Design an enzyme around this catalytic site. Structure first.
Site, PDB file in Angstrom:
ATOM      1  N   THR B 151       3.756  -0.579   4.411  1.00 23.27           N
ATOM      2  CA  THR B 151       4.083  -1.572   5.436  1.00 23.27           C
ATOM      3  C   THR B 151       4.844  -0.834   6.521  1.00 23.27           C
ATOM      4  O   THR B 151       5.751  -0.100   6.216  1.00 23.27           O
ATOM      5  CB  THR B 151       4.967  -2.718   4.904  1.00 23.27           C
ATOM      6  OG1 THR B 151       4.230  -3.548   4.007  1.00 23.27           O
ATOM      7  CG2 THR B 151       5.336  -3.668   6.043  1.00 23.27           C
ATOM      8  N   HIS B 272      -0.107 -12.203   1.577  1.00 22.43           N
ATOM      9  CA  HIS B 272       1.310 -12.043   1.402  1.00 22.43           C
ATOM     10  C   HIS B 272       1.938 -13.343   0.882  1.00 22.43           C
ATOM     11  O   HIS B 272       1.549 -14.448   1.308  1.00 22.43           O
ATOM     12  CB  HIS B 272       1.935 -11.643   2.751  1.00 22.43           C
ATOM     13  CG  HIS B 272       3.349 -11.166   2.635  1.00 22.43           C
ATOM     14  ND1 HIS B 272       4.406 -12.027   2.428  1.00 22.43           N
ATOM     15  CD2 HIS B 272       3.884  -9.920   2.696  1.00 22.43           C
ATOM     16  CE1 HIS B 272       5.529 -11.331   2.328  1.00 22.43           C
ATOM     17  NE2 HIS B 272       5.239 -10.050   2.491  1.00 22.43           N
ATOM     18  N   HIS B 305       0.105  -9.950  -3.450  1.00 23.68           N
ATOM     19  CA  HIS B 305       1.336  -9.379  -3.975  1.00 23.68           C
ATOM     20  C   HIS B 305       1.776 -10.059  -5.263  1.00 23.68           C
ATOM     21  O   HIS B 305       1.898 -11.282  -5.296  1.00 23.68           O
ATOM     22  CB  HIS B 305       2.440  -9.487  -2.960  1.00 23.68           C
ATOM     23  CG  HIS B 305       2.266  -8.610  -1.771  1.00 23.68           C
ATOM     24  ND1 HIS B 305       3.277  -7.773  -1.340  1.00 23.68           N
ATOM     25  CD2 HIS B 305       1.230  -8.420  -0.926  1.00 23.68           C
ATOM     26  CE1 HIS B 305       2.874  -7.149  -0.244  1.00 23.68           C
ATOM     27  NE2 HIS B 305       1.634  -7.506   0.013  1.00 23.68           N
ATOM     28  N   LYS B 312      11.777  -4.797 -13.169  1.00 23.76           N
ATOM     29  CA  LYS B 312      12.382  -5.631 -14.210  1.00 23.76           C
ATOM     30  C   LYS B 312      12.661  -4.769 -15.445  1.00 23.76           C
ATOM     31  O   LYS B 312      11.998  -3.755 -15.661  1.00 23.76           O
ATOM     32  CB  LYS B 312      11.460  -6.798 -14.633  1.00 23.76           C
ATOM     33  CG  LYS B 312      10.404  -7.277 -13.620  1.00 23.76           C
ATOM     34  CD  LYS B 312      10.825  -8.541 -12.883  1.00 23.76           C
ATOM     35  CE  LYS B 312      10.739  -9.791 -13.765  1.00 23.76           C
ATOM     36  NZ  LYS B 312      11.969 -10.650 -13.614  1.00 23.76           N
TER      37      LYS B 312
END
Lengths: 108, 445
Positions: B151, B272, B305, B312
């Site tokens: 991005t 997105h 996404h 995590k």
């Protein structure tokens, strides 16, 4: 200390690594076979590398379990078309896709 | 009339699993019944017009209650809805019907929609992905590895031409794609037509110099549908292979229209998930991301996404892996450990690329490749643009790392266990990767 990045043509998967010797190529063929994929060989003129359709070398190697025979065919394809780029693919029938594809010889 | 524990759902019914945290003292069956009613009929008290209808047929029915493991203050309510309650081919209508009013129910402390079973007969009415994973690979001629994207940052203040410069430098270094930020639509500092033109020039220039197909997710999120479609049309006009849409903030009506347009016009669609955390973060109130994942696959997108998984802890990854399967696979069996409450059959509806993004760099590559496998897009923002030698070098480092991990994986190595060795060996042939490894190595004092 900054190093300038040197641009050159590339060839999709594995083309950012050093070119493969026989041992490295064999390991990819063995992988494809272990996944149940059918190896295939293709070749094309260097200028036509972006073609969707390359010339097929013989037919895909269905049920082929012998890694050395596939490597021998790659070398045979090179001998038949010494100026061409040569690509190994592996067909995945369930996905209707290729599980693997890479350029073995980058052409000249 | 809405609690029906002997009801066996039909294979055509839509099913929902709601985690209900009731006000202490409220009867579980009554709460479950109430949620079924509000999400179908809205009411408990009969009026004369009800008696004009087949009341037994046209209602949601709660047919099972379960304990929530670990949480005595909540229970799961399983509700079935006849397929005919809904407009066909309308995620908008299904969503509105299920979640339009019930989250305001005052007799619960919180309501969470955990999962929705879309029957195959309903799935066949929805357009789905414009292309899906396998068609996209064929169109882009990309096989045997995850795709790589970045991005562009900063999100504000760059002219179209300067933005294009950043795009060009990333693409030429080995990224398959670059991406517009979610907030980049058409701003005074960079109007959309100029962005699209300079980005397409960048894309074409990098493609010519690499001999690999490139794209840039051009954001068509817009104030109105007219504007959204105009921007999509212009991307097609100039030869751009892929566009982007913010499906939740632009909204589901707009998204579904755009996905149909993309399917009709051969343009790939990157989705997105802006705003998801407003809806999906609170574990006791809202809509789980796995539901939003199903909604997107039906509405349509070619990429979505999903989160990075690696962000995590190890024991907390199962739910993410579950929704990644919901996004990509043809059939996903029930698996409570992974938060899948219903078997979900997609039939022949294609899968969608899982996009991993957010704080990842070269040292995450072994885990990313192992966890996501090949049908993923790995996005590296800071991890490309922050390379000390610039964007082309940054891109190349990520590309080399990716290819080295894939080669090792294919050789049968345990790439997570051997990740440092695999990367180190590859860095001996790539100065760009060697210094990237130095740049993002975690320093422990």
């Amino acid at each position: 200390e900054m190093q300038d990045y040197k641009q050159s043509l590339k060839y999709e998967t594995f083309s950012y690594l050093p070119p493969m010797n026989a041992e490295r190529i064999r390991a990819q063929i063995k992988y494809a076979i272990a996944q149940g994929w059918s190896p295939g060989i293709e070749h094309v003129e260097v200028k036509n590398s972006m073609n969707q359709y390359w010339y097929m070398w013989k037919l895909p190697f269905f049920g082929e379990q012998n890694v050395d025979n596939v490597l021998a065919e790659i070398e045979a394809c090179r001998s038949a078309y010494p100026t061409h780029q040569v690509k190994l693919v592996a067909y995945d029938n369930y996905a209707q896709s290729l599980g693997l594809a890479f350029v073995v010889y980058r052409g000249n | 009339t809405y609690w029906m524990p002997e009801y066996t759902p039909l294979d055509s019914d839509i099913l929902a699993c709601f985690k209900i945290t009731p006000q202490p003292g409220v009867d579980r069956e009554e709460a479950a019944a109430a949620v079924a009613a509000e999400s179908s009929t809205g009411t408990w008290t009969t009026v004369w017009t009800d008696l004009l209808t087949d009341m037994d047929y046209y209602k949601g029915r709660a047919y099972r209650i379960e304990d929530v493991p670990g949480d005595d203050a909540a229970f799961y309510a399983f509700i079935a809805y006849p397929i005919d309650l809904f407009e066909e081919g309308s995620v908008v209508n299904v969503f509105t019907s299920l979640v339009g009013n019930v989250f305001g129910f005052k007799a619960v402390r919180g309501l969470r929609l955990e999962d929705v079973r879309f029957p195959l007969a309903y799935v066949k009415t929805c357009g789905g992905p414009p292309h899906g994973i396998q068609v996209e690979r064929d169109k882009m001629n990309k096989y045997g590895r995850p795709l790589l994207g970045c991005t562009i940052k900063p999100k504000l203040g760059l002219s179209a031409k300067n933005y294009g410069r950043a795009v060009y430098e990333c693409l030429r270094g080995g990224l398959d794609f670059t991406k517009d930020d979610e907030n980049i639509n058409s701003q005074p500092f960079m109007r959309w037509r100029d962005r699209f033109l300079f980005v397409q020039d960048a894309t074409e220039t990098a493609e010519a110099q690499t001999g690999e197909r490139k794209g840039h997710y051009l954001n068509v999120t817009a104030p109105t549908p007219e504007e959204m479609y105009k921007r999509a049309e212009f991307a097609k006009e100039i030869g751009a292979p892929i566009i982007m849409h913010d499906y939740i903030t632009g909204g589901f009506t707009a998204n579904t229209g755009l996905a149909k347009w993309c399917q009709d016009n051969g343009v790939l669609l990157h989705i997105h998930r802006a705003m998801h955390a407003v809806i999906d973060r609170n574990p006791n109130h809202g809509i789980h991301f796995r539901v939003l994942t199903k909604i997107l696959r039906l509405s349509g997108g070619d990429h979505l996404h999903t989160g990075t998984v690696v962000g995590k802890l190890e024991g907390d990854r199962a739910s993410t892996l579950g929704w990644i399967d919901l996004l990509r696979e043809s059939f996903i069996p029930e698996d409570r450990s992974r938060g899948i409450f219903f078997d979900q059959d997609w039939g022949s509806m294609p899968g969608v690329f899982a996009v991993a993004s957010g704080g990842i760099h070269v040292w995450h590559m072994p885990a990313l490749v192992n966890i996501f496998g090949d049908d993923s897009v790995l996005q590296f923002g800071g991890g490309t643009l922050g390379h000390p030698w610039g964007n082309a070098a940054g891109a190349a480092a990520n590309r080399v790392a990716l290819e080295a991990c894939v080669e090792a994986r294919n050789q049968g190595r345990d790439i997570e266990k051997e990740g440092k060795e695999i990367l180190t060996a590859a860095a001996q042939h790539s100065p760009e990767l060697k210094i990237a490894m130095e740049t993002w190595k975690e320093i422990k004092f």
